[PDB]
Protein backbone atom coordinates (compact mmCIF):
# COMPACT_ATOMS: atom_id res chain seq x y z
CA UNK A 1 0.00 0.00 0.00
CA UNK A 2 1.49 3.39 -0.92
CA UNK A 3 0.31 6.58 -2.66
CA UNK A 4 2.56 5.90 -5.67
CA UNK A 5 1.07 2.43 -6.14
CA UNK A 6 -2.46 3.87 -5.84
CA UNK A 7 -1.50 6.28 -8.65
CA UNK A 8 -0.01 3.39 -10.67
CA UNK A 9 -3.29 1.50 -10.35
CA UNK A 10 -5.27 4.50 -11.66
CA UNK A 11 -3.38 4.67 -14.96
CA UNK A 12 -5.61 4.65 -18.05
CA UNK A 13 -4.12 3.04 -21.13
CA UNK A 14 -4.49 3.52 -24.86
CA UNK A 15 -4.30 0.54 -27.25
CA UNK A 16 -2.34 2.74 -29.66
CA UNK A 17 0.93 4.46 -28.68
CA UNK A 18 0.30 8.27 -28.72
CA UNK A 19 2.30 10.49 -31.09
CA UNK A 20 4.53 11.98 -28.37
CA UNK A 21 7.87 13.73 -28.69
CA UNK A 22 10.75 11.41 -29.59
CA UNK A 23 12.64 11.86 -26.33
CA UNK A 24 9.62 10.86 -24.31
CA UNK A 25 8.91 7.88 -26.56
CA UNK A 26 12.51 6.78 -26.27
CA UNK A 27 11.92 6.41 -22.50
CA UNK A 28 8.43 4.91 -22.72
CA UNK A 29 9.21 2.31 -25.29
CA UNK A 30 12.59 1.28 -23.78
CA UNK A 31 13.02 -2.46 -24.14
CA UNK A 32 14.17 -3.00 -20.52
CA UNK A 33 13.25 -1.89 -17.00
CA UNK A 34 14.55 1.56 -16.09
CA UNK A 35 17.36 0.39 -13.79
CA UNK A 36 20.31 0.94 -16.10
CA UNK A 37 18.90 3.99 -17.91
CA UNK A 38 18.37 5.61 -14.54
CA UNK A 39 21.95 4.71 -13.52
CA UNK A 40 22.90 6.35 -16.85
CA UNK A 41 21.83 9.72 -15.42
CA UNK A 42 24.70 9.39 -12.93
CA UNK A 43 22.75 7.87 -10.05
CA UNK A 44 22.85 4.90 -7.72
CA UNK A 45 19.57 2.96 -8.07
CA UNK A 46 17.91 1.10 -5.23
CA UNK A 47 14.63 -0.58 -4.58
CA UNK A 48 12.21 0.13 -1.73
CA UNK A 49 9.89 -2.86 -1.37
CA UNK A 50 6.29 -1.92 -0.97
CA UNK A 51 4.73 -5.38 -1.26
CA UNK A 52 6.12 -8.87 -2.06
CA UNK A 53 4.06 -12.07 -1.86
CA UNK A 54 1.87 -14.70 -3.48
CA UNK A 55 -1.68 -13.60 -4.40
CA UNK A 56 -4.71 -15.23 -6.00
CA UNK A 57 -6.70 -14.06 -9.06
CA UNK A 58 -8.90 -11.67 -7.15
CA UNK A 59 -5.86 -9.49 -6.38
CA UNK A 60 -4.76 -8.96 -10.00
CA UNK A 61 -7.81 -7.73 -11.88
CA UNK A 62 -5.88 -5.43 -14.21
CA UNK A 63 -3.32 -8.10 -15.11
CA UNK A 64 -5.55 -11.21 -15.21
CA UNK A 65 -6.80 -10.70 -18.78
CA UNK A 66 -3.22 -10.50 -20.03
CA UNK A 67 -1.87 -13.53 -18.17
CA UNK A 68 -2.51 -17.30 -17.98
CA UNK A 69 -5.32 -18.15 -15.52
CA UNK A 70 -3.69 -19.91 -12.55
CA UNK A 71 -4.16 -20.46 -8.85
CA UNK A 72 -1.46 -18.12 -7.76
CA UNK A 73 0.85 -15.29 -8.83
CA UNK A 74 3.90 -13.64 -7.34
CA UNK A 75 3.24 -9.91 -6.78
CA UNK A 76 6.13 -7.48 -6.44
CA UNK A 77 5.40 -3.75 -5.85
CA UNK A 78 8.31 -1.36 -5.53
CA UNK A 79 9.57 2.19 -5.50
CA UNK A 80 12.68 2.58 -7.67
CA UNK A 81 15.01 5.29 -6.28
CA UNK A 82 17.91 7.27 -7.80
CA UNK A 83 20.30 8.43 -5.05
CA UNK A 84 17.43 7.75 -2.66
CA UNK A 85 14.91 9.80 -4.54
CA UNK A 86 11.79 7.94 -5.76
CA UNK A 87 11.65 8.03 -9.59
CA UNK A 88 9.26 5.21 -10.45
CA UNK A 89 6.74 2.84 -8.92
CA UNK A 90 6.66 -0.66 -10.36
CA UNK A 91 4.21 -3.55 -10.03
CA UNK A 92 5.15 -6.95 -11.42
CA UNK A 93 2.79 -9.91 -11.54
CA UNK A 94 4.29 -13.29 -12.26
CA UNK A 95 2.02 -16.31 -12.89
CA UNK A 96 3.56 -19.07 -10.72
CA UNK A 97 4.07 -21.39 -13.73
CA UNK A 98 6.62 -18.82 -14.97
CA UNK A 99 8.63 -19.47 -11.78
CA UNK A 100 10.59 -22.44 -13.15
CA UNK A 101 14.24 -22.86 -14.08
CA UNK A 102 16.27 -19.64 -13.91
CA UNK A 103 13.04 -17.77 -13.52
CA UNK A 104 12.25 -19.15 -10.05
CA UNK A 105 14.77 -16.54 -8.92
CA UNK A 106 12.13 -13.85 -9.54
CA UNK A 107 10.50 -14.73 -6.26
CA UNK A 108 13.71 -14.20 -4.26
CA UNK A 109 15.02 -11.09 -6.05
CA UNK A 110 14.18 -8.92 -3.05
CA UNK A 111 15.58 -5.41 -3.26
CA UNK A 112 17.74 -6.19 -6.33
CA UNK A 113 16.24 -4.00 -9.11
CA UNK A 114 14.86 -5.86 -12.11
CA UNK A 115 16.59 -5.52 -15.47
CA UNK A 116 17.84 -7.48 -18.48
CA UNK A 117 21.23 -7.65 -16.80
CA UNK A 118 19.86 -10.35 -14.42
CA UNK A 119 18.61 -12.67 -17.21
CA UNK A 120 21.99 -14.21 -18.04
CA UNK A 121 20.66 -17.51 -19.47
CA UNK A 122 17.13 -16.85 -20.77
CA UNK A 123 15.89 -14.98 -23.84
CA UNK A 124 13.71 -11.95 -23.09
CA UNK A 125 10.98 -10.81 -25.48
CA UNK A 126 8.05 -8.40 -25.18
CA UNK A 127 4.80 -9.04 -26.90
CA UNK A 128 2.64 -6.25 -25.52
CA UNK A 129 3.23 -2.64 -24.46
CA UNK A 130 0.77 0.16 -23.85
CA UNK A 131 1.32 3.70 -22.54
CA UNK A 132 -1.01 4.99 -19.83
CA UNK A 133 -1.63 8.27 -18.05
CA UNK A 134 -2.95 9.42 -14.66
CA UNK A 135 -3.36 13.08 -13.75
CA UNK A 136 -0.38 14.52 -15.62
CA UNK A 137 1.89 11.49 -15.08
CA UNK A 138 2.93 8.82 -17.60
CA UNK A 139 3.07 5.09 -17.02
CA UNK A 140 3.14 1.94 -19.14
CA UNK A 141 2.35 -1.77 -18.95
CA UNK A 142 4.20 -4.54 -20.76
CA UNK A 143 3.88 -8.28 -21.08
CA UNK A 144 7.39 -9.69 -21.06
CA UNK A 145 8.49 -13.24 -21.71
CA UNK A 146 11.53 -15.09 -20.27
CA UNK A 147 12.05 -18.38 -22.15
CA UNK A 148 8.59 -17.68 -23.48
CA UNK A 149 7.03 -17.60 -19.98
CA UNK A 150 5.03 -14.46 -19.31
CA UNK A 151 4.95 -11.80 -16.66
CA UNK A 152 3.30 -8.42 -16.49
CA UNK A 153 5.25 -5.30 -15.57
CA UNK A 154 3.46 -1.99 -14.92
CA UNK A 155 5.56 1.18 -14.34
CA UNK A 156 4.53 4.70 -13.14
CA UNK A 157 7.04 7.47 -13.88
CA UNK A 158 7.18 9.83 -10.94
CA UNK A 159 7.70 13.50 -11.73
CA UNK A 160 11.16 13.44 -10.20
CA UNK A 161 12.21 11.20 -13.10
CA UNK A 162 13.94 12.66 -16.23
CA UNK A 163 10.90 12.02 -18.43
CA UNK A 164 9.58 15.35 -17.24
Curated annotation (Swiss-Prot):
Keywords: Cytoplasm, Lyase, Ubiquinone biosynthesis
Class of enzymatic activity (EC top level): lyase
Catalytic activity: chorismate = 4-hydroxybenzoate + pyruvate
A GO term for molecular function: chorismate lyase activity
GO terms, biological process: pyruvate biosynthetic process; ubiquinone biosynthetic process
Pathway field: Cofactor biosynthesis; ubiquinone biosynthesis
Entry EC number(s): 4.1.3.40
Subunit text: Monomer.
Function statement: Removes the pyruvyl group from chorismate, with concomitant aromatization of the ring, to provide 4-hydroxybenzoate (4HB) for the ubiquinone pathway.
Miscellaneous comment: The sdgG mutation, which suppresses a conditional mutation in dnaG (DNA primase), has been localized to one of the ubiA, ubiC or yjbI genes.
Name under which the protein is recorded: Chorismate pyruvate-lyase
Taxonomic source organism: Escherichia coli (strain K12)
